[PDB]
């Protein structure tokens, strides 16, 4: 849950209650700043998480020799200069989907054929 | 298995779901905490359909939302009622508990509490996990079937 | 007695969603209350009655809303059978097929690892004397002297060793 800090004293904003009006307010507990809530959702604790992620591409990935080159045509620029690798979420279950970094426009196409991502 | 019902596939996954230590923690997806002030209409518009029922037929504003997964909830044969009836009899008649049904796009268990009540709503956040059994014997995690 | 709770639920729900059925109200609601009243058990159940019917008439406001008349019936007969099962399976749309599509995905999870190992026809077994033996190189003392070689019989269970 996106969490805001205040101005000036720059600190953690803790949610307190507005009794007389029935609404939620974040406040600083070393200063005297208080502000309204942009949402009613205060705390989230994910257990079963849906995840499947790429890498930290610096675009300089093309400038690393130890990365393999396949030969698919990139969806947009059509250059057969790809470099690929598996999902960087190195968890035990995650699958063997290859991610292709087009060395011409830095587009990221996959090998997947069951689902779809704009990620 | 019992002499007779030993070669029955489904029969096997019925006993399975009665031995495996199934906690509320096993089926839970996300445990959220909302500031819902008027306990007669939910702030969340994906819940509106729920309250209509549990009113048609004095507490506190700090709501505690729980999303259960349909998938896990049918490996170990359970239904929303059974889940909800279990929490409501752990803290008994001092935690306002409600739950959806088995035909909504998303299952939800909404409960409210009854002088720092945001700090007592986490004492109880942990009990609703590592101290609550649904159906199964304790210490028996994972139960595999084999022919 | 508390049939009012039963009363309003039907009448109100089946006629207020949309004003489109008039006066057929005093037959849809009226008819399917004694069926629940004849089963309610004025106590007995203690809510196992409520639980069903209450939660039945909430399967009526959800995403099946095209089919969430009917009501208008296909043999509204479903409610006496809404006390056993309770139909239940019968209430969703093709989200049924999803529920039973999940069913299969759960059986596959229950069964365990399958011991698959390439068998050789270059082996004699004692138990069944068959030609179906797998082994695993290793290990004790490799080379000089020699090296162990432990087989197995996936038919019979026996184990021996070479050297
Ligand atoms: Zn401040
Ligand atoms: Zn490109
Ligand atoms: Zn053998």
Per DSSP, the residues of A16-48 read: EEETTTTEEEEEESSS--EEE-S-SEEEEEE-S
Specify whether A34 is located in the same domain as A68: no
Residues ≥6 apart with Cβ < 8 Å to A24 = A15, A17, A18, A36, A37, A40, A42, B35
Q: What is the dihedral of CA B100, B101, B102, B104, to 10 degrees?
A: -60
Residues A78, A108 share a domain? yes
Q: Are residues A67 and A117 in the same domain?
A: yes
If asked whether residues A78 and A30 sit together in one domain, one would say no
Q: Which positions of A make up the binding site for Zn(2+)?
A: 6, 9, 28, 31, 74, 77, 102, 105
Orientation of helix B9-16 relative to helix C95-110, angle to 10°:
80
Chain B residues within 8 A of C105 when measuring between CB atoms: 71
Domain count, chain A: 2
Handedness of CA A95, A96, A98, A99 (dihedral sign): positive
End-to-end CA distance of chain C: 87
Phi-psi region of B24 (alpha: psi -120 to 50; beta: other; left: phi over 0): alpha
Distance CA B44, CA B40 (A): 12
Q: Count CA atoms closer than 13 A to B40's CA, side-chain side.
A: 2
Separation CA C123–CA C153 (nearest Å): 10
Nearest to C126 by CA among C160, C95, C102, C96: C160
Please check whether residues A35 and A76 belong to one and the same domain.
no
- In 3D space, the residue among B113, B86, B110 whose CA is nearest the CA of residue B98 turns out to be B110
Q: How many CA atoms lie within 13 A of C77 on its CB side?
A: 2
Q: Which residue of A has its CA nearest to B65?
A: A44
Inter-chain touch A45–B36, beta carbons under 8 Å: no
Long-range Cβ contact pairs of A29-36 (< 8 A, separation 24 or more): A31/A6, A33/A6, A33/A7, A33/A8, A33/A9, A35/A4, A35/A6
Which two structure tokens, joined as six digits, stand for B51?
């309250």
- Indicate whether A51 and A98 sit together in one domain: yes
Q: What is the residue range of A13's domain? A: 1-45
User: Which of the other chains make 3 or more beta carbon contacts under 8 angstroms with chain A?
Assistant: B
d(CA B56, CA C57): 11
The C-alpha atoms of residue A104 and residue C153 are separated, in whole angstroms, by 56
Query: Exposed, middle or buried by CB within 10 Å (0-12, 13-18, 19+), for A21?
Result: exposed
Resolution in angstrom units: 3.8
B109, β-bridge pairs = B66, B99
Q: Per-domain residue ranges for chain C?
A: 1-93, 94-163
Query: Kindly report the CA angle at C107 between C106 and C108, in degrees rounded to 5?
Result: 90
CATH 3.20.20.70 fits C94-163, yes or no: no
- CA A13-A16-A19 angle, to 5 degrees, is 155
What technique was this entry resolved by? X-ray
On whether the CB atoms of residues B111 and B64 are closer than 8 A, the answer is yes
Q: Do residues A15 and A61 both lie within one domain? A: no
* Alpha carbon of residue C142 to chain centroid: 53
First to last CA, chain A: 21
Residues A92 and A54 in one domain: yes
Measured distance CA(B52)–CA(B55) in Å, rounded: 6
Q: Do A36 and A51 share a structural domain?
A: no
Chains B, C in contact, 3 or more Cβ pairs below 8 Å: yes
Residues A37 and A54 in one domain: no
Nearest to B30 among A17, A22, A47 (CB): A47
DSSP state of A63: G
Q: Kindly report the number of other CB atoms within 10 A of residue B47's CB atom.
A: 20
Calpha distance A60→A47 (Å, rounded) = 35
Question: Is residue B128 classed as helix, strand or coil in its secondary structure?
Answer: helix
A45 and B30 within 8 Å at the Cβ level: the answer is yes
Which CATH number characterizes residue A1's domain? 2.20.25.10
Q: Residue C139, preceding bond cis, omega within 30 degrees?
A: yes
């Amino acid at each position: 849950t996106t969490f805001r800090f205040c101005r000036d004293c720059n600190n953690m904003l803790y949610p307190r209650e507005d009794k007389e009006n029935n609404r939620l307010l974040f406040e600083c507990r070393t200063c005297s700043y208080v502000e309204e809530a942009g949402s009613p959702l205060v705390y989230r604790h994910e257990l079963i998480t849906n995840i499947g992620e790429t890498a930290g591409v610096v675009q300089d990935i093309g400038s690393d020799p130890t990365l393999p080159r396949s030969d698919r045509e990139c969806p947009k620029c059509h250059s057969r200069e790809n470099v690929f690798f598996q999902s960087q979420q190195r968890r035990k279950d995650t699958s063997m989907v290859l991610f292709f970094v087009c060395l011409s426009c830095s587009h990221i196409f996959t090998s997947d054929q069951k689902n779809k991502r704009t990620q | 298995l019992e002499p007779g019902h030993a070669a029955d596939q489904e029969q096997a996954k019925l006993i399975r779901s009665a031995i495996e230590h199934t906690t509320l923690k096993s089926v839970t997806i996300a445990s959220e905490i909302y500031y819902d002030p008027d306990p007669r209409s939910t702030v969340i518009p994906e819940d509106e359909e729920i309250i209509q029922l549990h009113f048609s037929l004095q507490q506190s504003p700090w709501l505690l939302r729980l999303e259960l997964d349909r998938a896990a909830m049918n490996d170990k044969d359970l239904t929303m009622g059974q889940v909800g009836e279990r929490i409501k009899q752990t803290f008994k008649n001092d935690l306002f508990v409600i739950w959806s049904e088995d035909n909504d796009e998303k299952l939800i268990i909404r409960c409210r509490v009854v002088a720092e009540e945001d700090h007592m709503l986490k004492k109880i956040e942990n009990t609703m996990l590592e101290n609550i059994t649904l159906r199964g014997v304790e210490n028996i995690e994972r139960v595999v079937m084999m022919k | 007695k508390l049939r009012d709770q039963v009363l309003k639920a039907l009448y109100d729900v089946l006629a207020k969603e949309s004003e489109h059925p008039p006066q057929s109200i005093l037959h849809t609601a009226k008819a399917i209350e004694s069926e629940m009243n004849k089963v309610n058990n004025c106590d007995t159940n203690e809510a196992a009655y409520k639980a069903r019917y209450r939660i039945i008439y909430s399967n009526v406001i959800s995403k099946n809303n095209p089919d969430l008349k009917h009501k208008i019936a296909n043999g509204d007969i479903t409610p006496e059978f809404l006390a056993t099962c309770d139909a239940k399976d019968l209430a969703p749309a093709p989200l049924k097929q999803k529920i039973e599509e999940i069913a299969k995905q759960n059986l596959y999870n229950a069964q365990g690892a399958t011991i698959e190992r390439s068998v050789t026809d270059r082996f004699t077994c004692g138990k069944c004397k068959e030609k179906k033996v797998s082994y695993y190189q290793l290990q004790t003392r490799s080379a000089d002297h020699p090296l162990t070689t432990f087989c197995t019989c996936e038919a019979c269970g026996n184990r021996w060793k070479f050297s």
